[PDB]
Design a protein around this ligand. Structure first.
Ligand SMILES: [Mg+2]
Ligand SMILES: [Mg+2]
Lengths: 296, 296
Protein backbone atom coordinates (compact mmCIF):
# COMPACT_ATOMS: atom_id res chain seq x y z
CA UNK A 1 0.00 0.00 0.00
CA UNK A 2 1.02 3.59 -0.67
CA UNK A 3 1.12 5.39 2.67
CA UNK A 4 1.59 8.86 4.12
CA UNK A 5 3.05 8.63 7.63
CA UNK A 6 5.47 10.43 9.95
CA UNK A 7 5.14 13.84 11.57
CA UNK A 8 2.17 15.73 10.12
CA UNK A 9 0.52 19.06 10.91
CA UNK A 10 -3.20 19.83 10.90
CA UNK A 11 -2.72 23.34 9.51
CA UNK A 12 -4.55 26.28 10.99
CA UNK A 13 -6.15 28.61 8.45
CA UNK A 14 -5.31 32.26 9.24
CA UNK A 15 -7.85 34.92 8.41
CA UNK A 16 -7.30 38.61 7.73
CA UNK A 17 -10.31 40.84 7.45
CA UNK A 18 -12.60 37.82 7.21
CA UNK A 19 -10.65 36.23 4.34
CA UNK A 20 -8.02 33.52 4.01
CA UNK A 21 -4.62 35.13 4.55
CA UNK A 22 -2.97 33.34 1.64
CA UNK A 23 0.49 34.80 2.26
CA UNK A 24 0.33 33.84 5.94
CA UNK A 25 -0.85 30.35 4.97
CA UNK A 26 2.15 29.78 2.69
CA UNK A 27 4.59 31.23 5.24
CA UNK A 28 3.20 28.92 7.94
CA UNK A 29 3.58 25.88 5.69
CA UNK A 30 7.19 26.76 4.86
CA UNK A 31 7.79 27.07 8.60
CA UNK A 32 6.45 23.52 9.02
CA UNK A 33 8.61 22.21 6.16
CA UNK A 34 11.75 23.80 7.59
CA UNK A 35 11.17 22.23 11.03
CA UNK A 36 11.20 18.58 9.98
CA UNK A 37 7.51 17.97 9.23
CA UNK A 38 6.80 15.07 6.86
CA UNK A 39 3.31 16.05 5.66
CA UNK A 40 0.77 18.84 6.08
CA UNK A 41 -3.01 18.54 6.37
CA UNK A 42 -4.80 21.52 4.79
CA UNK A 43 -8.45 22.28 5.61
CA UNK A 44 -8.96 19.70 8.32
CA UNK A 45 -10.72 20.36 11.60
CA UNK A 46 -7.82 22.47 12.90
CA UNK A 47 -8.06 24.42 9.64
CA UNK A 48 -11.76 25.23 10.20
CA UNK A 49 -12.90 23.16 7.20
CA UNK A 50 -16.52 23.61 8.32
CA UNK A 51 -16.54 27.39 7.74
CA UNK A 52 -14.51 27.57 4.51
CA UNK A 53 -16.08 27.74 1.05
CA UNK A 54 -15.30 25.24 -1.58
CA UNK A 55 -13.22 27.80 -3.37
CA UNK A 56 -11.22 28.42 -0.21
CA UNK A 57 -10.74 24.65 0.30
CA UNK A 58 -9.30 24.62 -3.20
CA UNK A 59 -7.15 27.63 -2.45
CA UNK A 60 -5.67 26.22 0.74
CA UNK A 61 -5.05 22.84 -0.90
CA UNK A 62 -3.38 24.47 -3.90
CA UNK A 63 -1.22 26.62 -1.62
CA UNK A 64 -0.19 23.51 0.33
CA UNK A 65 0.62 21.62 -2.88
CA UNK A 66 2.56 24.58 -4.27
CA UNK A 67 4.54 25.22 -1.08
CA UNK A 68 5.49 21.56 -0.79
CA UNK A 69 6.81 21.31 -4.32
CA UNK A 70 10.46 20.54 -4.51
CA UNK A 71 10.46 19.07 -1.00
CA UNK A 72 9.77 15.64 0.47
CA UNK A 73 6.77 16.99 2.40
CA UNK A 74 3.45 15.55 1.24
CA UNK A 75 -0.02 17.10 1.25
CA UNK A 76 -2.65 15.00 3.03
CA UNK A 77 -5.76 16.97 2.14
CA UNK A 78 -8.74 17.16 4.44
CA UNK A 79 -11.61 15.88 2.32
CA UNK A 80 -14.52 14.33 4.06
CA UNK A 81 -18.18 14.83 4.62
CA UNK A 82 -21.26 13.38 6.22
CA UNK A 83 -22.77 12.95 2.73
CA UNK A 84 -21.09 10.18 0.76
CA UNK A 85 -21.76 11.87 -2.58
CA UNK A 86 -20.09 14.93 -1.33
CA UNK A 87 -17.23 12.95 0.20
CA UNK A 88 -16.59 11.28 -3.12
CA UNK A 89 -16.53 14.63 -4.90
CA UNK A 90 -14.22 16.17 -2.31
CA UNK A 91 -11.80 13.24 -2.68
CA UNK A 92 -11.69 13.57 -6.47
CA UNK A 93 -11.39 17.34 -5.97
CA UNK A 94 -8.39 16.94 -3.63
CA UNK A 95 -6.61 14.49 -5.92
CA UNK A 96 -7.28 16.86 -8.84
CA UNK A 97 -5.50 19.66 -7.11
CA UNK A 98 -2.25 17.76 -6.40
CA UNK A 99 -2.87 16.30 -2.95
CA UNK A 100 -0.78 13.19 -2.25
CA UNK A 101 -3.57 11.64 -0.17
CA UNK A 102 -6.76 12.49 1.66
CA UNK A 103 -7.81 12.50 5.30
CA UNK A 104 -11.52 11.61 5.41
CA UNK A 105 -13.41 12.20 8.66
CA UNK A 106 -16.14 9.82 9.74
CA UNK A 107 -19.61 11.22 8.91
CA UNK A 108 -20.61 13.64 11.64
CA UNK A 109 -24.11 14.27 13.00
CA UNK A 110 -26.12 11.73 10.96
CA UNK A 111 -24.63 8.74 12.85
CA UNK A 112 -24.34 6.07 10.14
CA UNK A 113 -24.20 2.43 11.14
CA UNK A 114 -21.04 0.38 10.70
CA UNK A 115 -22.43 -0.99 7.44
CA UNK A 116 -23.05 2.56 6.23
CA UNK A 117 -19.56 3.64 7.27
CA UNK A 118 -18.10 0.74 5.27
CA UNK A 119 -20.06 1.67 2.14
CA UNK A 120 -19.20 5.35 2.69
CA UNK A 121 -15.44 4.79 2.75
CA UNK A 122 -15.50 2.13 0.02
CA UNK A 123 -17.11 4.66 -2.32
CA UNK A 124 -14.50 7.27 -1.40
CA UNK A 125 -11.59 4.85 -1.84
CA UNK A 126 -12.89 3.64 -5.19
CA UNK A 127 -13.16 7.24 -6.44
CA UNK A 128 -9.41 8.06 -6.37
CA UNK A 129 -6.06 6.32 -6.76
CA UNK A 130 -4.26 8.07 -3.89
CA UNK A 131 -3.95 6.99 -0.24
CA UNK A 132 -6.96 7.48 2.03
CA UNK A 133 -6.56 7.86 5.79
CA UNK A 134 -9.67 7.32 7.89
CA UNK A 135 -10.29 9.82 10.70
CA UNK A 136 -12.15 8.63 13.82
CA UNK A 137 -13.07 11.36 16.32
CA UNK A 138 -16.29 10.23 18.05
CA UNK A 139 -16.43 13.16 20.46
CA UNK A 140 -16.98 15.41 17.43
CA UNK A 141 -18.86 13.17 15.00
CA UNK A 142 -21.21 11.31 17.34
CA UNK A 143 -20.21 8.01 15.73
CA UNK A 144 -17.33 5.55 16.05
CA UNK A 145 -15.64 3.56 13.30
CA UNK A 146 -15.28 0.18 14.98
CA UNK A 147 -12.03 -1.76 14.85
CA UNK A 148 -13.69 -4.43 12.68
CA UNK A 149 -14.89 -1.78 10.23
CA UNK A 150 -11.48 -0.10 10.02
CA UNK A 151 -9.76 -3.45 9.47
CA UNK A 152 -12.28 -4.54 6.82
CA UNK A 153 -11.81 -1.25 4.95
CA UNK A 154 -8.02 -1.57 5.15
CA UNK A 155 -8.14 -5.14 3.80
CA UNK A 156 -10.89 -4.64 1.22
CA UNK A 157 -9.84 -1.28 -0.27
CA UNK A 158 -6.37 -0.66 -1.61
CA UNK A 159 -6.20 3.08 -1.04
CA UNK A 160 -7.23 2.88 2.63
CA UNK A 161 -3.99 2.42 4.57
CA UNK A 162 -4.83 3.30 8.18
CA UNK A 163 -6.68 5.56 10.58
CA UNK A 164 -6.12 8.81 12.46
CA UNK A 165 -7.45 8.12 15.96
CA UNK A 166 -8.68 10.93 18.19
CA UNK A 167 -10.61 8.79 20.66
CA UNK A 168 -8.68 8.71 23.97
CA UNK A 169 -8.75 4.91 23.76
CA UNK A 170 -5.35 3.22 23.87
CA UNK A 171 -7.19 -0.11 24.24
CA UNK A 172 -8.60 0.38 20.74
CA UNK A 173 -5.11 1.29 19.50
CA UNK A 174 -3.91 -2.07 20.82
CA UNK A 175 -6.99 -3.71 19.31
CA UNK A 176 -6.27 -2.23 15.87
CA UNK A 177 -2.57 -3.11 15.64
CA UNK A 178 -2.87 -6.50 17.35
CA UNK A 179 -5.38 -7.72 14.76
CA UNK A 180 -4.08 -5.76 11.73
CA UNK A 181 -0.40 -4.90 12.25
CA UNK A 182 -0.01 -3.80 8.60
CA UNK A 183 -2.17 -0.69 8.97
CA UNK A 184 -0.83 2.79 9.74
CA UNK A 185 -2.21 4.00 13.07
CA UNK A 186 -1.85 7.78 13.26
CA UNK A 187 -2.14 9.71 16.52
CA UNK A 188 -4.78 12.43 16.40
CA UNK A 189 -4.33 13.41 20.07
CA UNK A 190 -1.09 15.23 20.84
CA UNK A 191 -0.93 14.41 24.55
CA UNK A 192 -0.72 10.68 23.78
CA UNK A 193 1.47 10.84 20.66
CA UNK A 194 4.19 8.76 22.30
CA UNK A 195 1.97 5.94 23.67
CA UNK A 196 0.37 5.54 20.25
CA UNK A 197 3.76 5.58 18.50
CA UNK A 198 5.35 3.23 21.05
CA UNK A 199 2.60 0.69 20.29
CA UNK A 200 3.53 0.70 16.59
CA UNK A 201 1.70 3.79 15.39
CA UNK A 202 3.55 5.33 12.45
CA UNK A 203 2.76 9.02 12.69
CA UNK A 204 0.89 11.92 14.20
CA UNK A 205 -1.45 14.49 12.73
CA UNK A 206 -0.77 17.24 15.19
CA UNK A 207 -2.30 20.42 16.53
CA UNK A 208 0.70 21.28 18.70
CA UNK A 209 3.09 21.13 15.73
CA UNK A 210 1.52 24.38 14.45
CA UNK A 211 3.26 26.12 17.36
CA UNK A 212 6.14 23.70 18.06
CA UNK A 213 6.83 21.85 14.79
CA UNK A 214 10.45 21.02 15.66
CA UNK A 215 9.44 19.32 18.91
CA UNK A 216 6.62 17.23 17.40
CA UNK A 217 8.84 16.28 14.44
CA UNK A 218 11.71 15.21 16.71
CA UNK A 219 9.34 13.21 18.94
CA UNK A 220 7.88 11.37 15.95
CA UNK A 221 11.24 10.66 14.32
CA UNK A 222 12.80 9.46 17.59
CA UNK A 223 9.89 7.05 18.00
CA UNK A 224 10.03 5.85 14.38
CA UNK A 225 13.77 5.32 14.92
CA UNK A 226 12.84 3.23 17.99
CA UNK A 227 14.47 5.79 20.28
CA UNK A 228 11.52 5.55 22.64
CA UNK A 229 13.38 7.09 25.57
CA UNK A 230 14.00 10.32 23.65
CA UNK A 231 10.50 10.36 22.16
CA UNK A 232 8.94 9.99 25.61
CA UNK A 233 10.98 12.86 27.05
CA UNK A 234 9.61 15.24 24.40
CA UNK A 235 6.09 13.85 24.90
CA UNK A 236 6.35 14.44 28.65
CA UNK A 237 7.75 17.93 28.15
CA UNK A 238 4.93 18.74 25.72
CA UNK A 239 2.11 17.55 28.02
CA UNK A 240 1.30 20.99 29.46
CA UNK A 241 1.03 22.71 26.08
CA UNK A 242 -0.65 19.64 24.57
CA UNK A 243 -3.41 19.89 27.18
CA UNK A 244 -3.89 23.66 27.29
CA UNK A 245 -4.35 23.65 23.52
CA UNK A 246 -7.73 22.00 24.19
CA UNK A 247 -8.84 24.14 27.16
CA UNK A 248 -11.39 25.31 24.58
CA UNK A 249 -12.44 23.53 21.39
CA UNK A 250 -9.63 23.14 18.90
CA UNK A 251 -8.62 25.28 17.01
CA UNK A 252 -9.51 28.15 19.39
CA UNK A 253 -6.47 27.64 21.68
CA UNK A 254 -3.93 26.91 18.93
CA UNK A 255 -4.90 30.04 16.99
CA UNK A 256 -4.69 31.97 20.25
CA UNK A 257 -1.19 30.55 20.77
CA UNK A 258 -0.11 31.27 17.19
CA UNK A 259 -1.32 34.85 17.62
CA UNK A 260 0.40 35.21 21.00
CA UNK A 261 3.65 33.91 19.48
CA UNK A 262 3.40 36.46 16.66
CA UNK A 263 3.07 33.73 14.03
CA UNK A 264 -0.29 34.93 12.66
CA UNK A 265 -1.45 38.51 12.29
CA UNK A 266 -4.85 38.47 13.87
CA UNK A 267 -6.79 36.32 16.23
CA UNK A 268 -9.69 35.81 13.81
CA UNK A 269 -12.10 32.87 13.54
CA UNK A 270 -15.26 32.26 11.54
CA UNK A 271 -18.43 31.90 13.55
CA UNK A 272 -19.52 29.80 15.37
CA UNK A 273 -15.86 29.73 16.45
CA UNK A 274 -14.70 32.74 18.43
CA UNK A 275 -11.99 34.09 20.72
CA UNK A 276 -11.43 32.33 24.08
CA UNK A 277 -12.45 33.65 27.40
CA UNK A 278 -10.18 36.10 29.09
CA UNK A 279 -9.22 33.39 31.48
CA UNK A 280 -8.27 30.75 28.91
CA UNK A 281 -6.41 33.37 26.87
CA UNK A 282 -4.30 34.01 29.97
CA UNK A 283 -3.85 30.29 30.68
CA UNK A 284 -2.58 29.68 27.13
CA UNK A 285 -0.11 32.56 27.44
CA UNK A 286 1.02 31.22 30.82
CA UNK A 287 1.65 27.66 29.58
CA UNK A 288 3.58 28.88 26.52
CA UNK A 289 6.28 30.48 28.69
CA UNK A 290 8.12 27.22 29.32
CA UNK A 291 8.41 26.39 25.60
CA UNK A 292 10.69 27.71 22.88
CA UNK A 293 8.64 28.68 19.85
CA UNK A 294 10.48 28.76 16.53
CA UNK A 295 9.99 31.89 14.47
CA UNK A 296 10.08 32.25 10.71
CA UNK B 1 -43.34 36.36 20.72
CA UNK B 2 -44.55 34.54 17.61
CA UNK B 3 -44.42 30.80 18.26
CA UNK B 4 -44.93 27.51 16.44
CA UNK B 5 -45.97 24.82 18.92
CA UNK B 6 -48.22 21.78 19.27
CA UNK B 7 -47.86 18.39 17.61
CA UNK B 8 -45.14 18.54 14.93
CA UNK B 9 -43.55 15.98 12.60
CA UNK B 10 -39.93 15.73 11.45
CA UNK B 11 -40.81 14.63 7.92
CA UNK B 12 -38.97 11.74 6.33
CA UNK B 13 -37.75 12.39 2.78
CA UNK B 14 -38.75 9.51 0.48
CA UNK B 15 -36.38 8.73 -2.37
CA UNK B 16 -37.31 7.08 -5.64
CA UNK B 17 -34.53 5.93 -7.99
CA UNK B 18 -32.04 8.16 -6.22
CA UNK B 19 -34.14 11.35 -6.33
CA UNK B 20 -36.68 12.94 -3.99
CA UNK B 21 -40.11 11.38 -4.61
CA UNK B 22 -41.99 14.66 -4.77
CA UNK B 23 -45.39 13.08 -5.14
CA UNK B 24 -44.86 10.86 -2.17
CA UNK B 25 -43.54 13.84 -0.17
CA UNK B 26 -46.68 15.91 -0.76
CA UNK B 27 -48.87 12.86 -0.06
CA UNK B 28 -47.09 12.22 3.24
CA UNK B 29 -47.61 15.84 4.32
CA UNK B 30 -51.32 15.71 3.40
CA UNK B 31 -51.54 12.58 5.56
CA UNK B 32 -49.97 14.47 8.50
CA UNK B 33 -52.37 17.41 8.05
CA UNK B 34 -55.37 15.09 8.00
CA UNK B 35 -54.36 13.39 11.27
CA UNK B 36 -54.26 16.46 13.51
CA UNK B 37 -50.61 17.51 13.20
CA UNK B 38 -50.02 21.22 13.85
CA UNK B 39 -46.72 21.73 12.02
CA UNK B 40 -44.33 19.84 9.78
CA UNK B 41 -40.54 20.08 9.73
CA UNK B 42 -39.17 19.57 6.21
CA UNK B 43 -35.48 18.80 5.70
CA UNK B 44 -34.52 18.13 9.30
CA UNK B 45 -32.43 15.26 10.62
CA UNK B 46 -35.28 12.79 10.09
CA UNK B 47 -35.53 14.14 6.53
CA UNK B 48 -31.83 13.42 5.85
CA UNK B 49 -30.91 17.11 5.34
CA UNK B 50 -27.21 16.18 5.28
CA UNK B 51 -27.51 14.21 2.02
CA UNK B 52 -29.94 16.50 0.18
CA UNK B 53 -28.65 19.08 -2.27
CA UNK B 54 -29.49 22.76 -1.92
CA UNK B 55 -31.97 22.41 -4.72
CA UNK B 56 -33.63 19.42 -3.00
CA UNK B 57 -33.81 21.47 0.13
CA UNK B 58 -35.62 24.22 -1.80
CA UNK B 59 -37.90 21.72 -3.35
CA UNK B 60 -38.94 20.02 -0.10
CA UNK B 61 -39.60 23.32 1.68
CA UNK B 62 -41.68 24.56 -1.26
CA UNK B 63 -43.73 21.35 -1.30
CA UNK B 64 -44.33 21.67 2.45
CA UNK B 65 -45.35 25.33 2.15
CA UNK B 66 -47.61 24.62 -0.83
CA UNK B 67 -49.24 21.59 0.79
CA UNK B 68 -49.92 23.55 4.02
CA UNK B 69 -51.60 26.55 2.33
CA UNK B 70 -55.25 26.92 3.24
CA UNK B 71 -54.69 24.91 6.38
CA UNK B 72 -53.68 25.88 9.81
CA UNK B 73 -50.57 23.72 9.57
CA UNK B 74 -47.28 25.57 9.81
CA UNK B 75 -43.96 24.82 8.16
CA UNK B 76 -41.03 24.87 10.58
CA UNK B 77 -38.26 24.41 8.05
CA UNK B 78 -35.01 22.72 8.95
CA UNK B 79 -32.40 25.44 8.45
CA UNK B 80 -29.22 24.96 10.45
CA UNK B 81 -25.53 24.53 9.82
CA UNK B 82 -22.24 24.39 11.68
CA UNK B 83 -21.09 27.45 9.69
CA UNK B 84 -22.82 30.61 10.88
CA UNK B 85 -22.61 32.31 7.48
CA UNK B 86 -24.35 29.31 5.91
CA UNK B 87 -26.93 28.98 8.70
CA UNK B 88 -27.86 32.64 8.13
CA UNK B 89 -28.22 31.99 4.41
CA UNK B 90 -30.38 28.92 5.03
CA UNK B 91 -32.59 30.90 7.43
CA UNK B 92 -33.16 33.68 4.88
CA UNK B 93 -33.63 30.99 2.24
CA UNK B 94 -36.35 29.25 4.25
CA UNK B 95 -38.21 32.49 5.03
CA UNK B 96 -38.11 33.71 1.44
CA UNK B 97 -39.57 30.37 0.29
CA UNK B 98 -42.58 30.71 2.60
CA UNK B 99 -41.60 28.85 5.78
CA UNK B 100 -43.47 29.95 8.90
CA UNK B 101 -40.38 29.44 11.07
CA UNK B 102 -37.06 27.64 11.21
CA UNK B 103 -35.59 24.84 13.29
CA UNK B 104 -31.84 25.47 13.54
CA UNK B 105 -29.66 22.72 15.01
CA UNK B 106 -26.70 23.52 17.25
CA UNK B 107 -23.44 23.50 15.21
CA UNK B 108 -22.28 19.92 14.79
CA UNK B 109 -18.68 18.65 14.72
CA UNK B 110 -16.77 21.91 15.30
CA UNK B 111 -17.99 22.28 18.94
CA UNK B 112 -18.36 26.06 19.41
CA UNK B 113 -18.20 27.46 22.91
CA UNK B 114 -21.26 28.88 24.66
CA UNK B 115 -20.13 32.35 23.58
CA UNK B 116 -19.85 31.12 19.99
CA UNK B 117 -23.27 29.47 20.14
CA UNK B 118 -24.77 32.74 21.37
CA UNK B 119 -23.20 34.73 18.53
CA UNK B 120 -24.19 31.99 16.07
CA UNK B 121 -27.89 32.05 16.96
CA UNK B 122 -27.95 35.82 17.44
CA UNK B 123 -26.76 36.23 13.84
CA UNK B 124 -29.36 33.76 12.56
CA UNK B 125 -32.21 35.37 14.50
CA UNK B 126 -31.25 38.87 13.37
CA UNK B 127 -31.33 37.78 9.70
CA UNK B 128 -35.06 36.89 9.54
CA UNK B 129 -38.38 38.04 10.98
CA UNK B 130 -39.94 34.60 11.53
CA UNK B 131 -39.76 32.43 14.67
CA UNK B 132 -36.55 30.49 15.32
CA UNK B 133 -36.54 27.30 17.39
CA UNK B 134 -33.17 26.13 18.68
CA UNK B 135 -32.43 22.41 18.45
CA UNK B 136 -30.18 20.81 21.09
CA UNK B 137 -29.08 17.24 20.37
CA UNK B 138 -25.60 16.72 21.90
CA UNK B 139 -25.40 13.02 21.00
CA UNK B 140 -25.33 14.11 17.35
CA UNK B 141 -23.56 17.51 17.49
CA UNK B 142 -20.90 16.92 20.13
CA UNK B 143 -21.89 20.19 21.82
CA UNK B 144 -24.58 21.34 24.24
CA UNK B 145 -26.52 24.60 24.27
CA UNK B 146 -26.48 25.29 28.00
CA UNK B 147 -29.59 26.41 29.85
CA UNK B 148 -27.99 29.82 30.44
CA UNK B 149 -27.20 30.19 26.73
CA UNK B 150 -30.72 29.13 25.69
CA UNK B 151 -32.27 31.55 28.18
CA UNK B 152 -30.03 34.44 27.09
CA UNK B 153 -30.92 33.85 23.44
CA UNK B 154 -34.63 33.71 24.29
CA UNK B 155 -34.42 37.00 26.19
CA UNK B 156 -32.09 38.86 23.79
CA UNK B 157 -33.63 37.91 20.42
CA UNK B 158 -37.17 38.45 19.40
CA UNK B 159 -37.49 35.45 17.09
CA UNK B 160 -35.95 32.78 19.30
CA UNK B 161 -38.95 31.44 21.19
CA UNK B 162 -37.77 28.12 22.64
CA UNK B 163 -35.75 24.96 22.14
CA UNK B 164 -36.29 21.45 20.83
CA UNK B 165 -34.49 19.20 23.32
CA UNK B 166 -33.15 15.77 22.33
CA UNK B 167 -30.90 15.29 25.35
CA UNK B 168 -32.45 12.65 27.65
CA UNK B 169 -32.20 15.22 30.42
CA UNK B 170 -35.45 15.99 32.24
CA UNK B 171 -33.38 17.83 34.87
CA UNK B 172 -32.41 20.32 32.16
CA UNK B 173 -36.06 20.58 31.13
CA UNK B 174 -36.91 21.59 34.70
CA UNK B 175 -33.97 24.01 34.79
CA UNK B 176 -35.12 25.66 31.55
CA UNK B 177 -38.76 26.22 32.49
CA UNK B 178 -38.14 26.98 36.18
CA UNK B 179 -35.89 29.92 35.29
CA UNK B 180 -37.61 31.00 32.04
CA UNK B 181 -41.22 29.75 31.98
CA UNK B 182 -42.10 31.91 28.94
CA UNK B 183 -40.07 29.81 26.50
CA UNK B 184 -41.54 27.00 24.39
CA UNK B 185 -39.86 23.73 25.34
CA UNK B 186 -40.39 21.20 22.54
CA UNK B 187 -39.82 17.49 23.00
CA UNK B 188 -37.38 16.07 20.48
CA UNK B 189 -37.44 12.57 22.02
CA UNK B 190 -40.65 10.65 21.38
CA UNK B 191 -40.34 8.25 24.32
CA UNK B 192 -40.45 11.15 26.80
CA UNK B 193 -43.00 13.34 25.03
CA UNK B 194 -45.37 13.17 28.00
CA UNK B 195 -42.85 14.00 30.79
CA UNK B 196 -41.67 17.07 28.87
CA UNK B 197 -45.22 18.24 28.15
CA UNK B 198 -46.37 17.59 31.72
CA UNK B 199 -43.57 19.87 32.95
CA UNK B 200 -44.88 22.72 30.79
CA UNK B 201 -43.46 21.77 27.42
CA UNK B 202 -45.71 23.08 24.67
CA UNK B 203 -45.13 20.71 21.77
CA UNK B 204 -43.25 17.84 20.19
CA UNK B 205 -41.18 17.49 17.04
CA UNK B 206 -41.74 13.80 16.58
CA UNK B 207 -40.27 10.92 14.61
CA UNK B 208 -43.05 8.47 15.52
CA UNK B 209 -45.72 10.84 14.16
CA UNK B 210 -44.51 10.00 10.64
CA UNK B 211 -46.04 6.54 11.19
CA UNK B 212 -48.66 7.32 13.86
CA UNK B 213 -49.62 10.99 13.39
CA UNK B 214 -53.05 10.62 15.00
CA UNK B 215 -51.63 9.12 18.20
CA UNK B 216 -48.85 11.68 18.64
CA UNK B 217 -51.26 14.53 17.90
CA UNK B 218 -53.81 13.20 20.40
CA UNK B 219 -51.07 12.76 23.03
CA UNK B 220 -49.93 16.37 22.59
CA UNK B 221 -53.38 17.96 22.64
CA UNK B 222 -54.52 15.95 25.65
CA UNK B 223 -51.39 17.19 27.44
CA UNK B 224 -51.84 20.81 26.34
CA UNK B 225 -55.36 20.61 27.83
CA UNK B 226 -53.86 19.18 31.05
CA UNK B 227 -55.65 15.88 30.39
CA UNK B 228 -52.52 14.21 31.70
CA UNK B 229 -54.05 10.79 32.35
CA UNK B 230 -55.02 10.48 28.69
CA UNK B 231 -51.74 11.90 27.41
CA UNK B 232 -49.73 9.57 29.65
CA UNK B 233 -51.78 6.58 28.45
CA UNK B 234 -50.81 7.21 24.82
CA UNK B 235 -47.19 7.92 25.77
CA UNK B 236 -47.05 4.63 27.67
CA UNK B 237 -48.71 2.67 24.85
CA UNK B 238 -46.29 4.28 22.38
CA UNK B 239 -43.14 3.40 24.33
CA UNK B 240 -42.39 0.17 22.43
CA UNK B 241 -42.59 1.78 18.98
CA UNK B 242 -40.90 4.96 20.24
CA UNK B 243 -37.93 2.83 21.31
CA UNK B 244 -37.70 0.47 18.34
CA UNK B 245 -37.66 3.50 16.04
CA UNK B 246 -34.12 4.14 17.34
CA UNK B 247 -32.82 0.54 17.31
CA UNK B 248 -30.62 2.03 14.57
CA UNK B 249 -29.87 5.70 13.94
CA UNK B 250 -32.92 7.75 13.03
CA UNK B 251 -34.24 7.88 10.32
CA UNK B 252 -33.23 4.29 9.43
CA UNK B 253 -35.99 2.64 11.53
CA UNK B 254 -38.77 5.14 10.71
CA UNK B 255 -38.14 4.86 6.97
CA UNK B 256 -38.17 1.08 7.43
CA UNK B 257 -41.52 1.33 9.24
CA UNK B 258 -43.00 3.66 6.61
CA UNK B 259 -41.94 1.21 3.90
CA UNK B 260 -43.35 -1.78 5.82
CA UNK B 261 -46.64 0.11 6.27
CA UNK B 262 -46.82 0.74 2.52
CA UNK B 263 -46.61 4.49 3.08
CA UNK B 264 -43.50 4.91 0.89
CA UNK B 265 -42.62 2.92 -2.20
CA UNK B 266 -38.89 2.31 -1.69
CA UNK B 267 -36.66 1.65 1.32
CA UNK B 268 -34.02 4.01 -0.06
CA UNK B 269 -31.53 6.13 1.87
CA UNK B 270 -28.57 8.20 0.76
CA UNK B 271 -25.19 7.02 1.95
CA UNK B 272 -23.82 7.00 4.55
CA UNK B 273 -27.30 5.94 5.69
CA UNK B 274 -28.37 2.45 4.62
CA UNK B 275 -30.98 -0.22 5.22
CA UNK B 276 -31.16 -1.75 8.73
CA UNK B 277 -29.85 -5.18 9.61
CA UNK B 278 -32.15 -8.10 8.73
CA UNK B 279 -32.82 -8.60 12.37
CA UNK B 280 -33.59 -4.98 13.12
CA UNK B 281 -35.89 -4.98 10.07
CA UNK B 282 -37.78 -7.93 11.59
CA UNK B 283 -37.93 -6.33 15.06
CA UNK B 284 -39.44 -3.16 13.60
CA UNK B 285 -41.95 -5.36 11.78
CA UNK B 286 -42.99 -7.05 14.92
CA UNK B 287 -43.51 -3.88 16.99
CA UNK B 288 -45.60 -2.20 14.32
CA UNK B 289 -48.17 -4.99 14.67
CA UNK B 290 -49.43 -3.55 17.97
CA UNK B 291 -50.24 -0.22 16.49
CA UNK B 292 -53.03 0.83 14.26
CA UNK B 293 -51.40 2.70 11.39
CA UNK B 294 -53.48 5.24 9.48
CA UNK B 295 -53.40 4.99 5.70
CA UNK B 296 -53.84 7.78 3.19
MG1 LIG C 1 -49.83 27.81 6.83
MG1 LIG D 1 -59.50 20.88 24.09
Amino acid sequence: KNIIIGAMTALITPFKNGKVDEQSYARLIKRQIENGIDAVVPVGTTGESATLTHEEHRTCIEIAVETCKGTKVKVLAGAGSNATHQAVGLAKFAKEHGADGILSVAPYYNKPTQQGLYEHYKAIAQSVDIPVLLYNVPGRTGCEISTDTIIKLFRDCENIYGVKEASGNIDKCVDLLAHEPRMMLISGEDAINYPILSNGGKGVISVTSNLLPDMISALTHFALDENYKEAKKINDELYNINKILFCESNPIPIKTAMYLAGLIESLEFRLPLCSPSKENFAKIEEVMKKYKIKGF
